[PDB]
Design a protein around this ligand. Structure first.
Ligand SMILES: *[C@@H]1O[C@H](CO)[C@@H](O[C@@H]2O[C@H](CO)[C@@H](O[C@@H]3O[C@H](CO[C@H]4O[C@H](CO[C@H]5O[C@H](CO)[C@@H](O)[C@H](O)[C@@H]5O)[C@@H](O)[C@H](O)[C@@H]4O)[C@@H](O)[C@H](O[C@H]4O[C@H](CO)[C@@H](O)[C@H](O)[C@@H]4O)[C@@H]3O)[C@H](O)[C@H]2NC(C)=O)[C@H](O)[C@H]1NC(C)=O
Ligand SMILES: *[C@@H]1O[C@H](CO)[C@@H](O[C@@H]2O[C@H](CO)[C@@H](O[C@@H]3O[C@H](CO)[C@@H](O)[C@H](O[C@H]4O[C@H](CO)[C@@H](O)[C@H](O)[C@@H]4O[C@@H]4O[C@H](CO)[C@@H](O)[C@H](O)[C@@H]4O)[C@@H]3O)[C@H](O)[C@H]2NC(C)=O)[C@H](O)[C@H]1NC(C)=O
Lengths: 669, 669
């Protein structure tokens, strides 16, 4: 009941070497051969084993100067740390073949900082062509400390320090149980100990382990600091991809807001206090994460120069808008051209493609970075390697901070400003000659919470003894997560001539906060894409059934590594972990319903699938179409020029079943 | 012990003529020759005595409309006043020969405003090529009102009104003595009577008459409003000079902070209040200087327009930074080119070379001018001629205001940002083949205070009789100033191959406030240049000895103009007044030490003096090198790629002897 895939001899060996690097991540097994290789591995001597002579040499210059020390906390948002990560990445990426790649990782495991290494290695496995189709573990199994509050962490430490339970019945009262040879820890979301404002209503979504894993994967698939030359025709669509990822996410987030009675993400000002604080319960081996109190003055002394930069970055965009056509960064740009999204997105991201370069440079200040830093409310870094981490210093923690959504909402709104320059689609562009959707029905939509466990053993240090006996996997975290029942969408379509067609499904809200029905005019960016697929219509009447379990845009829960070691002994590999790893998890498709049925709408659009003109398959198997991302809702709409027979809006209601509140799953006795 | 130099009777005559203008500056001896000349001198009639037809006619058109009247305060920061000052400057500068120049000045002295006259005269003498080699007295002897508090000034005034002392022994209690036919007045720094913030710890430095006089010399050697075409080579290096002057000044000042336990120069915002006030104790014959209380809100109604200007001026720069390469002011500028420092500096000073013009124009609004006005806290000028002066309307007083250092720290920092586009030097450019420094040794470095007197006679008004008999020199001010004992520096070098070499000496802090050692990466701009020189290396081992009083970047105290008359009778002039006019005074070379010995470091650089492809001899006898100013600390450094055998960092300690506190010298007993 987990989507499998079969696998040969050479594959399993490599995959085992790859997975070796994600276990006991913060320690070293002296007896493991990865260590014997690693200790003595000579990079200079091996120079002929890399595609890029200057990458080896650049790495070597940095490595003698000195890399970040071990145990210190790694973040890519800081110059020196990132530069070392990139130098390391290149070395992984330009290794002639697997053997060389493997050995280089061995050395790097042994000699360099843990976070820096996993960061670079993870990315490398995703980017190397010979590695395509291999599997990596879930971010939460690799970095467990970042996916869980203190309370849990500390129970784990205590149990480990005691080598078990002094009182099993007392431990039980704290949600700690022995299940055969596992220690299982129940975990509440933070609102169960902290309700310091209404945003805490959303913790089952913002603290969700999958959602946060999802953002991490997105970063890794194409990090901002690197070109996208490797992905070919997506290079000319990179900005579009950046807008759409964020647009989709904020729609999804917004949906969660609506169902907990919260409305719009609030606007903010670099020159004013920001309302909602963030009080993180994460610990770092060396420090606590930094808090932002409520009404925090973003314009305090330490931030003056920072705010001057950020304000100018924005103002420079506002200038672009005002002048329509202009030259910036070596490019004549026209805001009338829909292709300009590429520039717009690239600018807001300060990625390598903005400059037409392979890697970004220190003097090219990113807006995202400094915005993250200021809103993170940290004191000034002590030095190049010693900073006070906030949620927004890591891709694995960002979604936890309401301020993150404020920051990307603002960015998305500026891109929407650019999108106002595009002419709206006319009838002719949308009309599907002789095709009409006559009905849509939907099975009941119910959400519900359900326990989920993940391997949390990397959070813990084992003894020399335990590392040798390989007893390194006995810590699991149990947590209630959002889920929903599978559902069919029944679509009835009429057409004169048989034809190849594209079907698209979107989710959007039905009402604003006041209970007025949504116009497309104001609300086209609040539509969330559920699925696209192709069918063949016949003359007459058509019945199209599509199940939620088969929506192209979502993945299944990933499998724990231990379960993957099991499968590799059988020649099996978890399919969704191989090629669908960076999709949103299925269980989070729907926002949490209400007991009464919260009102939403399904938008179904059917259009002709002409041929395979402009065709994305290098980055994402997403857009085998000539069409903008989120077509037909990638620009302003006029309600009356828009609605055509091959469109259907269906009113639907999202229900919720069982326990309403995650914490009711975590009570003892 | 004053460095002398011999001269002929033609010089003495011209020199006496030049000096005559600085006697009794606020009055007219209608008996003196300068009067007879001045009264009747017809300018129109003498048009053929000027290199520039239209400068004469421009002047005479200005003069018929009317110039700034007598007695009112002049400052070059106000449009109409500047333009009259320049108009008069041209007249002085284009005089055919000395005779013409002299008669012209006589006219200007009798008929024009005295601060206006003096300002132009001073510059003219430095600028006229036929005046190179001449001596001008110390600015504190010329504008003694600017170099002393109200307290001393009032005592001086009281003594003149009474025509002496009613009570010798009561006078003594007030720090007033008669020695010879002189009145000596002791004077404290302002902190002995005012302690409104911590910045008052530093008034022996910021109130130092030498330091302030220094800044006025710097301005006079190259006014922002005038092209540098007359200095040839320096033109393509003007911006670099501007940066270097402030960078140096601020390193020196920062050192005074550290020894007084005060740390970094605070940053500010145009949109926020600024913390540290200034409460000037200086008097204008017409008005009091403006006060800025602590927590002065920069952004009040009267400043809304000026602050919109400052902000765009800054932001345009942030945009240049973000753009890297761009066309500004009719020039394509590239930020990876180190030579762009010319444009960078010019942009911040808004000097004539920014526009490639002879003289700046009214509509070319200056950033520094408007920062000075905003921070000056004055109410709006009454009219074109009537303003409420602040320390920052004058070069003679600017250094007295903590806000001065914050303004230029601000500008320097923005320049540092651009410096990040420069590639750091490699091993290769810094490495002296076969040369190594084995040791550096320093004599004890000690500071101490000793009394210093100056002629303050210009602050006082004499009677018709006294003006006749020429008893007009009788007022001296006695004030403790910082000084230091002479010290030697032994450099021991090894070289296999004999050759010419440059030796450079730099001073720097050793620790921040936390007492962590300065890394070069962060702290390269906190280095202060003490000395530049060349020697001949031989095969083997050499000892290079250099005394602190051979240091090229510093000068001895000026001698009073009275003593210059004594000397001119022997046919002598003091050397350091003639060609070392605008260096910092030697006594202020070192920061005030502590009695336990404050930790600094001394940096010593030795590199080949190859040829002299391009060397500075125009304004400054300074960089006889193709090397950037502050080479090799003119751009960001990499600790690892930096240190080579021909560099030496030595830990040094700065002591202090006798009284720690200046006021202790002015106690009567
Ligand atoms: C309490 O607080 C303090 C203050 O923050 C902490 O003190 C710091 O501790 C760390 C140790 O954790 C120290 O780092 C070490 O410094 C050693 C020496 O530093 C300098 O020398 C290096 C070596 O080069 C020398 O070569 C010759 C000798 O023949 C000399 O000519 C020359 O002077 C050099 O000293 C230089 O490369 C470097 O630039 C330093 O200036 C290092 O030997 C050592 O390096 C090792 O460790 C690295 C770990 O990342 C690794 O990259 C390297 O490969 C190498 O093996 C190490 O880094 C700091 O010096 C020290 N700071 C200060 C200001 O004193 C203290 O740890 C903390 N205590 C507790 C309990 O928390
Ligand atoms: C620069 O800055 C420093 C610091 O601010 C100044 O230093 C201060 O100088 C003061 C003198 O001006 C000094 O005050 C004296 O202190 C001594 C020692 O205790 C006293 O003997 C003096 O008292 C006499 O004058 C008083 C009023 O002026 C009288 O009340 C008093 O009576 C006394 O007179 C004598 O005493 C007899 C009374 O029985 C009388 O019969 C007899 O005839 C005497 O005349 C002063 O109080 C400060 O103490 C000193 N501050 C410090 C911290 O040291 C310095 O003056 C400033 N310099 C300049 C040039 O401006």
């Amino acid at each position: 009941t987990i989507k499998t895939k079969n696998v040969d001899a050479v594959f399993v060996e490599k995959q085992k070497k790859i997975l070796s690097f994600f276990q006991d991540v913060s320690q070293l097994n002296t007896d493991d051969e990865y260590y014997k290789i690693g200790k003595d591995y000579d990079i200079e001597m091996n120079m002929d084993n890399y595609t890029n002579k200057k990458a080896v040499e650049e790495f070597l210059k940095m490595y003698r100067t000195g890399f970040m020390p071990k145990n210190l906390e790694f973040s890519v948002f800081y110059d020196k740390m990132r530069d070392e990560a990139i130098a390391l990445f290149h070395l992984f990426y330009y290794a002639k073949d697997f053997e060389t790649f493997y050995k280089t990782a061995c050395f790097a495991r042994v000699h360099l900082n843990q976070g820096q290494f996993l960061y670079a290695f993870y990315i490398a496995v995703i980017q190397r062509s010979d590695c395509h189709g291999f599997v990596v573990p879930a971010p939460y199994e690799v970095y467990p400390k970042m996916f869980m509050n203190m309370e849990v962490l500390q129970k784990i430490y205590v149990t480990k320090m005691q080598d078990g339970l002094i009182n099993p019945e007392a431990a039980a009262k704290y949600g700690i149980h022995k299940e055969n040879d596992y220690f299982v820890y129940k975990a509440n979301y933070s609102n169960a100990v902290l309700y310091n404002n209404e945003e805490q209503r959303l913790t089952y979504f913002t603290e969700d382990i999958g959602m946060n894993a999802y953002y991490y994967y997105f970063h890794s698939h194409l990090p901002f600091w690197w070109t996208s030359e490797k992905y070919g025709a997506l290079k000319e669509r990179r900005g579009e991809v950046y807008f759409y990822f964020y647009q989709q996410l904020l729609a999804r987030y917004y949906f969660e807001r609506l169902t907990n009675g919260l409305g719009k993400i609030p606007e903010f000002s670099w020159y004013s206090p920001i309302k909602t604080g963030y009080y993180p319960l994460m610990l770092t081996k060396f420090t606590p994460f930094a808090q932002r109190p409520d009404y925090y003055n973003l314009h305090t002394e330490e931030n003056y120069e920072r705010v001057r930069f950020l304000d100018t970055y924005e103002k420079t965009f506002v200038q672009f808008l005002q002048k329509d056509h202009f030259e910036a960064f070596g490019q004549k740009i026209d805001f009338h051209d829909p292709k300009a999204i590429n520039f717009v997105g690239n600018y807001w991201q300060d990625n390598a493609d903005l400059y037409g370069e392979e890697v970004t440079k220190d003097y090219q200040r990113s807006y995202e970075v400094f915005a993250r830093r200021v809103l993170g409310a940290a004191p000034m870094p002590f030095d190049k390697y010693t900073f006070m981490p906030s949620a927004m210093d890591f891709y694995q923690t960002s979604l936890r901070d309401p301020a993150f959504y404020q920051l990307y909402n603002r960015i998305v709104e500026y891109i929407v400003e650019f999108k106002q320059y595009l002419k709206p689609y006319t009838q002719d562009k949308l009309y599907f000659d002789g095709v009409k959707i006559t009905d849509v029905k939907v099975d009941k939509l119910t959400t519900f919470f359900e326990n989920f466990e993940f391997d949390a053993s990397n959070s813990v240090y084992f003894s020399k003894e335990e590392i040798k006996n390989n007893h390194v996997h006995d810590v699991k975290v149990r947590q209630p997560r959002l889920n929903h029942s599978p559902f069919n969408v029944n679509i009835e379509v009429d057409s004169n001539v048989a034809s190849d067609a594209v079907v698209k499904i979107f989710l959007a809200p039905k009402y604003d906060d006041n209970g007025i029905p949504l116009t497309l005019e104001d609300n086209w960016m609040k539509f969330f894409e559920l699925d696209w697929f192709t069918t063949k219509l016949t003359a007459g009447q058509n019945k199209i059934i599509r199940n939620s379990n088969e929506f192209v845009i979502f993945k299944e829960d990933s499998v724990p590594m231990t379960e993957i070691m099991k499968m590799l002994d059988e020649g099996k590999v978890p399919f969704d972990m191989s090629e669908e790893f960076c999709y949103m998890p299925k269980r989070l498709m729907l926002p949490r319903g209400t007991e009464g049925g919260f009102p939403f709408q399904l938008f179904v659009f059917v259009y002709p699938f002409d041929n395979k003109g402009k065709d994305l398959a290098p980055f994402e198997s997403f857009v085998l179409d000539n069409k903008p991302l989120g077509f037909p809702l990638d620009r302003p709409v006029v309600d009356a020029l828009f609605k055509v027979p091959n469109m259907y809006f269906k009113d639907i209601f999202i229900y919720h079943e069982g326990e309403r509140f995650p914490y009711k799953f975590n009570i003892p006795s």
